[PDB]
Symmetry: C3
Subunit: 530 residues, 3 copies
């Protein structure tokens, strides 16, 4: 019997080439006066390239107040990336989409800026105090040219390749308090980029045409559950997700965990911030709180009843001249005077600790509560919104002054962790006919399983064929029949009107990957498959 | 320029070269995928059986089977929580069959074992603090657990090479049958919880999803499939045999505990936190309540068998050869510090060796709270292991014990939890203790393989990139789907048609309760079958 | 719910490749077996294990795993094993035949190749049982229980399983394993009897491999990458690799040299190996001498120690640095004291001082009447990974105008000996980047230069590793199925060597870390051709 050899193979002689890591400085242009970096790659010996890495020199941050960078700061800096030739754009991506494509890559995410040095909230006490030390971050600009290394690489057929990087405002990548002088920081801050790539000098290159997937995104109107992608002729995939819109707020939040980014870390940071005003050890009724505040003295039993909710408060080593007090309405929301009230104090069941005579403060030991990721994600503006018949924010001025501005451009869902799924039903139509529909997030489950990711989206994959070696499988259009567009309609999950999160404005994001043919006939050019 | 002169000169034509910078983009088979979800037909030894029928002219092929399950709202009084990876634990057996019979089938535990290295699949099946932490109900209408939906990835051989490996429907009807384990297996609860009503009210609500493919002019070729078979040996017996082995790709060997001789009750459980340290810390925390007592005079509410001793001025309490250092701050003048010297004890003879849990503690420090009237422990020095946390309560009070055994308070005993997890391995909750001292595999009369160390487990973990492997003998190192798998071939005439497994178990102390944990040997064999798509899908055992 | 009408209508002459079915090819008839062998131990009287593989059945092999039997450690003192103990045991591994060495690697290079394999690292010995520092109280007390560790000897024969496997053409294959002294793999204090342990300790190895009995094997020649390392002279920022004719890659990194010290360190975190774990362990060790609750001025400290009573406001000023100390439940007869110069360093009197006490800003806690000790709650400090990595010898060096170590005798007795052979950079985590510039010359011409560690970023990205090195990769061609792409020599032009020049950043002379010696490591992977014609043999590509 004829047998295939599994113990030996003919070591084929490959194309004669030589790689080199090339680093280039850019040309900065302020064009809405947005920072734009341009990198021109033109050399007769750079035959092909891939693995684009953009480095960024973050400056020394000096002065007073609270300051920190958003996690994966390097990716958050990116607004748009374009790779173009003389014939036009070869490939381009939106900042968030590049990040989404790199969310599984722990190494790329770490390189972009994910450390306690960068992401923890540091405090500066004097005008010449160093808040943050200068650092360099590296952003892996993942392109379709990296899929199969040399086989997939961008070939430069004697053409000039321009890599354009559009940057987001520094407001988006920074978490700060009112005390921090952001006005001066915004004026003084400048993006310092450098583009690196693996260049290949190839001897007698044999160029063949290839296929590329170019992502397109469409953002629907504020609170609009529909979005449409026009002129769809050959699509490999379609992703659907939601983003919050905070334009109706001052983008201020009570707490932030810093480098520690788990759901529990977000919750613990919030609890810690509230505990300062929640349980007070004072000689007589506490002061510095608004008139709307209902601070009740804890009885001998330790139980304070806020309607049907019982809060057990027991503090050790309390001085004889002092008493234990509980703020029964620290944060409250109500649309009507005779409606359900969402009270944050009611989310606490037990608070234990010991009063320190030396530092004159309470040292909390164990806290029993029901605080969730949504509570930590509520903007402060929504607690004091017009819709609320109550004051809302009954915290001290000291606590309110510690509030942080978060303008992270890549937030998904209605919480900081994208934990809460707000899509109750998804409907995708090709033309007018229903292409796909679901009541459960089964497309997200398949995305997470097939891509081995923990942070996936509701994705419809049409290409299950191996990349580069095969022409990708695409959903083909029929203009005559009307099937030349992908229309998405969602049904948002119904939330209680008396909860502050109900008023978070939502935006539907639809991402479509269209197939293009790469032609190298007299320069690099792409053609949309139609 | 950008390229260095040294590189340029080094490069700047006679030999034939393979192109590594470009490739001919081959046109693939014209197809269209679709995520299809189906509702089942529920049937009821009164075990739940869900049936899903897949029959469509246009569903040419399928793969990536995912079973969703709607978990109900749990209301009432008592302690309740779901086992980790609840979705997998629900599964007793999965079968994929056609008109010609079974195409592929797996046992619940084997599907779980095949998915243990997939963190995503495990998370989807139900692994969260919301599901797995032990929640408490205070009133008959208090919500213990909120309704949730779990997703179970039914990994099949059809997913290995995506479209290439997919199950081709030769215009035949495919039935997917799912047999469910009793709800007792997936739930951790105390005595206070009304399990009787819960068992009656609970219903499995499944839904089968799969990636279906509509293929234009499909060119079908025959393929090969590995079907797993398991053999469970007799209780406490160190042998098991898999008969009729003809063409096997692999053989796995592991141990399972048997708790049929117990009420399946355990002192503690850590919840969502599943590390070895989490299991130990939960156990220590549960005992500390009755171990160190701050009371005005001798403590009450403990059995007569208990020996609660007052801690002397030096802080050292001697329990035979073991010294326990107990020092509690802010103790009221009217009160004293007491140590329970025999919280849990075991012995087979009146004056023999004694396994005392109190003796496993060396130092206990803390501060008494006047406000809450309880001790707040700071630092604990102990030698509590994963085995202690895995001892069923029944064994502490068994007939073998000359002592009372359980000298805990009634309050502590009432907090004990029922754990019926069907996929436990070894003699502890983490499968930490290796109880197999030697393993021998015999293919007839001749020794096929033998080992003193779990080097077969090390190879399994390395080759499968898994952290929780088993002693596995792999015979197929050939790439799957593209090649016919390599197997251990049988010689019927020489009696080499059966795989016999013999183990040498470790010897444990009779005065330690873990000695009485019954063991079962599990042997898993993957048999090679040929998939014939000639007039309906059918399988044939390679013999 | 079934196939949707839109999909059916979309589908309902060109040659198409079948992606739904494939011809299940009959492979070469073979049979694998996990074979385990015992070695031959030989004896600076270095331990060497030899494993001879020669069998008519064994046609080919791969996936070498070396197991090691760690003994029961009994007696007094503090003892622990280094993390990944199994890899740290290895000094060198060589696979040779009658024709000579087929492949060989240095201990550290094998570890470097396995650093991205979490499973291989766990198997080698990474647990609280092995790596935490355990204490022995009686001469017959068990410190560490006996355990078995498994070391995955990653070779080029594992890359493509059976395809890449080492073929044994009726030749005798010898696997030689050289072991590092037991001093390298063990973390211990002065109380521990290392002298007896070193005498009593014996390496107990066992080599396992996946062997293949192949029927009518069809052997073809292959290519192998053999790593070579060159260690530069102490603190010299240059190193050269000679006879470089065809190299697939070149790596550059730094190692510390502690030959000028007794290899003693104040603290070690144990199994917990994060940067924060190293810092927290150090802070915890200093805290008992830093803040003292005593009736009158504290005793048991050298005369050089400046222990100041904490004032009513809690602020103690050490020059420009203010330290806030507030301890609860302090007895009326006792006072709170702060050690203002626990560890200090300076090369000139009345100049800049590096004081560890000055690195603390706030210390809070509660005094325990029951245990007669302070239980610290919150500590605000600026202690870094470098502080935890300073050998004790440097604090009391001749360069220091001060006593340096003003800790108690109790604290000094708890100091641990760390001789880990695979440390990189100038700290235990290799956090501090000490290379400011890298220059690589092929012959006399500049092959590559960088000011930033972009070669390390590329290494980490391409190898999916979190702990990479400045690496220049020349081969981007798939392995086994293709002949690797390499740099080409030109003997006539003198281009047959790789010269590395780095520019190190300079430390402050008044910081003890300036006195930690450095060594430049350059690793070169040369291409060799594997021939099976009358035995297994390798030939260097020119
Ligand atoms: C499980 O996959 C296997 C199924 C095989 O069976 C079988 C019947 O089905 C195949 C499929 C489905 C392929 O898609 C394929 C392929 O795309 C490919 C070559 C050609 N290979 N070479 C021919 C001669 N050789 C000495 C050099 C290159 C193939 O033969 C196959 C192939 C088969 O033969 N690729 C190319 O032509 C090009 C343009 C580049 C290749 C680059 C590197 C070299 C390869 O990717 C290496 C790294 C390996 O990954 C593969 C070889 C896979 O081997 C393993 C163990 O994974 C193999 C596909």
């Amino acid at each position: 019997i004829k047998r295939s050899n599994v113990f030996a193979v003919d070591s084929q002689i490959p194309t004669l080439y030589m790689p080199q890591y090339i680093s280039l400085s850019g040309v900065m242009t302020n064009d809405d006066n947005q920072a734009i970096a341009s990198f021109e790659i033109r050399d007769q010996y750079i035959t092909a390239l891939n693995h684009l890495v953009l480095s960024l020199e973050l400056p020394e941050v000096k002065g007073m107040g609270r300051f920190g960078y958003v996690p994966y700061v390097g990716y958050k800096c990116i607004n748009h990336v374009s790779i173009s030739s003389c014939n036009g754009v070869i490939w381009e991506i939106e900042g968030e989409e590049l990040y989404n494509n790199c969310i599984n890559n722990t190494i790329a995410l770490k390189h972009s800026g994910y450390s306690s040095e960068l992401n923890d909230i540091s405090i500066g006490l004097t005008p010449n105090d160093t808040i943050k030390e200068p650092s360099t971050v590296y952003v892996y600009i993942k392109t379709p040219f990296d899929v199969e290394d040399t086989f997939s690489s961008l070939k430069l057929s004697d053409s000039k390749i321009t890599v354009t990087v559009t940057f987001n405002p520094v407001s988006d990548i920074v978490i700060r308090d009112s005390s921090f002088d952001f006005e001066t920081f915004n004026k003084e801050f400048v993006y310092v980029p450098e583009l690196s790539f693996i260049g290949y000098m190839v001897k007698n290159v044999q160029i063949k045409p290839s296929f590329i997937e170019k992502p397109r995104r469409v953002i629907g109107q504020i609170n609009q559950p529909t979005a449409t992608v026009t002129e769809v002729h050959a699509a490999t995939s379609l992703s659907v997700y939601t983003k919050p819109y905070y334009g109706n707020t001052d983008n201020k939040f009570i707490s932030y965990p810093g480098y520690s980014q788990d759901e529990k870390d977000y919750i613990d940071a919030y609890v810690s911030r509230l505990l300062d005003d929640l349980v007070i050890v004072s000689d007589g009724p506490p002061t510095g709180y608004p008139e709307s505040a209902e601070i009740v003295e804890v009885p001998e039993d330790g139980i304070v009843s806020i309607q049907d909710a019982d809060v057990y408060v027991k503090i050790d080593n309390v001085p004889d001249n002092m008493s234990v007090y509980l703020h029964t309405n620290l944060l409250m929301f109500g649309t009507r005077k005779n409606s359900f009230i969402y009270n944050i104090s009611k989310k606490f069941s037990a608070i234990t600790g010991t009063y320190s005579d030396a530092t004159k403060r309470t040292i909390f030991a164990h806290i029993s509560h029901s605080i969730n990721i949504i509570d930590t994600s509520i903007p402060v503006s929504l607690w004091t919104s017009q819709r609320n018949v109550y004051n809302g924010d009954n915290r001290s001025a000291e606590s309110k002054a510690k509030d942080l501005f978060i303008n992270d451009p890549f937030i998904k869902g209605i919480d900081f962790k994208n934990k809460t799924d707000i899509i109750s039903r998804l409907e995708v139509r090709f033309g007018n006919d229903v292409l796909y529909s679901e009541n459960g997030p089964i497309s997200r489950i398949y995305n997470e399983l097939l891509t081995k990711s923990n942070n996936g989206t509701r994705t419809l994959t049409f290409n299950f064929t191996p990349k580069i070696f095969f022409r990708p499988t695409t959903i083909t259009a029929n203009v005559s029949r009307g099937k030349d567009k992908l229309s998405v309609r969602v049904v948002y999950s119904t939330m209680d009107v008396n909860h502050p999160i109900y008023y978070v404005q939502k935006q539907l994001v639809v991402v479509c990957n269209d197939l293009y043919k790469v032609s190298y006939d007299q320069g690099v050019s792409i053609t949309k498959i139609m």
